Write a protein that binds this ligand. Structure first.
Ligand code: BGC
Ligand code: BGC
Ligand code: BGC
Ligand code: BGC
Ligand code: BGC
Ligand code: BGC
Lengths: 121, 121
């Protein structure tokens, strides 16, 4: 189970460890690039990079998947969008009214899977 | 509800969105640097960067804090240690037998606070 703990005082401006996302994609997601770190293979084409502002987070997301991640799109709490990138294989699954905290996953030559850590509202 | 969800298939090798950590420190934590992205001020001295290997995550952490983050130390499941860095002020608190998932927080000229998301085992 996901939990959290706060340490420290009340000062300063908020930040998140999740800074940016890009992907390489063709018919599948070949790779996801998190904070500049490449996870996956060398196929497909490189998307533009989406950089989160302060206070910004993924609030809704659609992931198409089967054996691999086929496609990703998301929208933030500030009305910004990323994607869709990828193909039309697999089946869709959507998250709505969330706050994504972290993106982990598994990868080889492709992005096999995403493990999304989030608050569900 | 804090939760997580897996999308996709069974293949590939796990990765984390939290790839590396460094700090600037003196008597306090001046800054935390997450996947190279700086949060905090330019005081103190810059630590080496700690980069997580495959299958490696933070398993134990000690944070000293008061009005700021005074000190951080952690150990991974592979037995590698980071820190301690910072000073001897504040009060200590420890996470034990965890998997750290994400590090968020707040910062100004110093690291004011951390919000650590983790699984407790
Ligand atoms: O995304 C999976 C594959 O889709 C194909 O259409 C592209 O030509 C490849 O480079 C890519 O690896
Ligand atoms: O996720 C990659 C592929 O997995 C297969 O199991 C599905 O049948 C395809 O629709 C999908 O494109
Ligand atoms: O990413 C697609 C695949 O790439 C291969 O190189 C890995 O060994 C598989 O486990 C994985 O399913
Ligand atoms: O970490 C708090 C402060 O500690 C002092 O010992 C250092 O000289 C400063 O550069 C630093 O900003
Ligand atoms: O965290 C910065 C400082 O906060 C104060 O509230 C504590 O009394 C000090 O011990 C600590 O060094
Ligand atoms: O980070 C320590 C301090 O730096 C200042 O610049 C900010 O205005 C304070 O909110 C913060 O507590």
């Amino acid at each position: 189970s996901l939990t959290h703990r706060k340490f420290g005082g009340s000062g300063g401006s908020p930040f998140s460890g999740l800074s940016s996302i890009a992907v390489r994609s063709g018919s599948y997601l070949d790779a996801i690039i998190i904070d500049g770190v490449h996870h996956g293979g060398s196929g497909g084409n490189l998307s533009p990079t989406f950089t989160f502002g302060s206070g910004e987070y993924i609030s809704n997301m659609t992931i198409r998947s089967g054996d691999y991640i086929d496609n990703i799109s998301f929208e933030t709490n500030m009305g910004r969008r990323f994607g869709p990138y990828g193909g039309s294989g697999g089946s869709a699954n959507t998250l709505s009214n969330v706050k994504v905290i972290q993106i982990n996953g598994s990868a080889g030559d492709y992005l096999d899977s995403l493990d999304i850590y989030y608050e569900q509202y």
